[PDB]
Amino acid sequence: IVGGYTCGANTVPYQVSLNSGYHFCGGSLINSQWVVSAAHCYKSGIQVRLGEDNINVVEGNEQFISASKSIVHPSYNSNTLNNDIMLIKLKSAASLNSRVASISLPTSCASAGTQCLISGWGNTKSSGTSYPDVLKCLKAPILSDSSCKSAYPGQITSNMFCAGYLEGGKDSCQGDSGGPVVCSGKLQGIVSWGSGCAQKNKPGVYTKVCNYVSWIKQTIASN
Amino acid sequence: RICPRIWMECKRDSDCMAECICVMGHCG
Ligand SMILES: [Ca+2]
Q: How far apart are CA B5 and CA A157, in angstroms?
C-alpha cells in the first residue's frame, strides 16, 4: 500500500496472507473454511496465515492452515485478468474469535464515490522498494466508470472497477494482490492490477465482487 | 500496461507476469 497508514494489530480480522515460503498475495476470509483471493495468485501448496499483523514475528494470535483446494473462476483470462477471482478451501476450519473473523458478501454493487478500505502487506513505495512487516491500510473512493475507462483505454471490463486517486500518491501495489476492498462492511473488491503504483491518472483496478456473489455461494456449498 | 499486483522475484523481464517488468529484481 502506497501513501497509507498502519491498520493496528488485528483491526482487519478478515485479512489473510497467502504464503509459499514467503508472503506473495493477500486474501479475505469469508467463512471458517473459505478464503477469496485473485486467480493470478494461484499456486500449489499454499499455506494460509490468519490473525497476522507482523508477518515476521510470531505474536500468538496466528493460525496457519494449508489450502486443501483452490477453485479458479471458469472464465478467468490470464492475459486480460478478466474474472480475476479464486476460492481457497482450508484443510481445517479456522477458529473464529476476536482477531479472526469473516467479512460479509455484498447484496448490491457499490456506487462511485463510496469510501472503501484497502489493506495489505505490499510495497509501500511508488519508486523503489519497501515491504512492511505490519499490515497497512488505505481509505479510497470508488471511481466512476468513465474515469476508469479513460485511464485504461480498452482494458477495463464489466467485471472490474477503479478505486483510488487520479492525482496519484495513494494506491495498492505489488504484494497487495488478492486482498480486500471493503465498503460499508461488505467485500466489494479484490486487489488485481494496475500500471505502476500510485502514478498520476493510473488508479488501481479491482475485481468487482458483486458480479460473483451467486458463483461464490454455489461453489462454497458444493465443495 | 497490465501488471498484476502479486509479489514476485525475478532475474529478467521475462520472469514476470502479464505486462509486468523486472524492476531491479522485483516484478512491477
Ligand atoms: Ca506474525
A: 18
Contacts with B6 from chain A: Cβ below 8 Å: 24-25, 38, 40-41, 174-175, 177-178
* Candidate from B2, B5, B24 with C-beta closest to A174: B5
CATH architecture of A1-12+103-210: Beta Barrel (2.40)
Partnered with residue A24 across adjacent β-strands are: none
Between the CA of A47 and the centroid of ligand 1 the distance, in Å, is 14
Resolution expressed in Å:
1.8
What are the cell numbers at A216? 461464490
The span from the CA of A71 to the CA of A218, in Å, is 12
The domains of chain A are located at 1-12+103-210, 13-102+211-223
> Options 1.10.8.420, 3.90.1150.10, 2.40.10.10, 2.40.160.10; which CATH number does A13-102+211-223 get?
2.40.10.10
Determined by which method? X-ray
The three cell numbers of residue B4 are 498484476
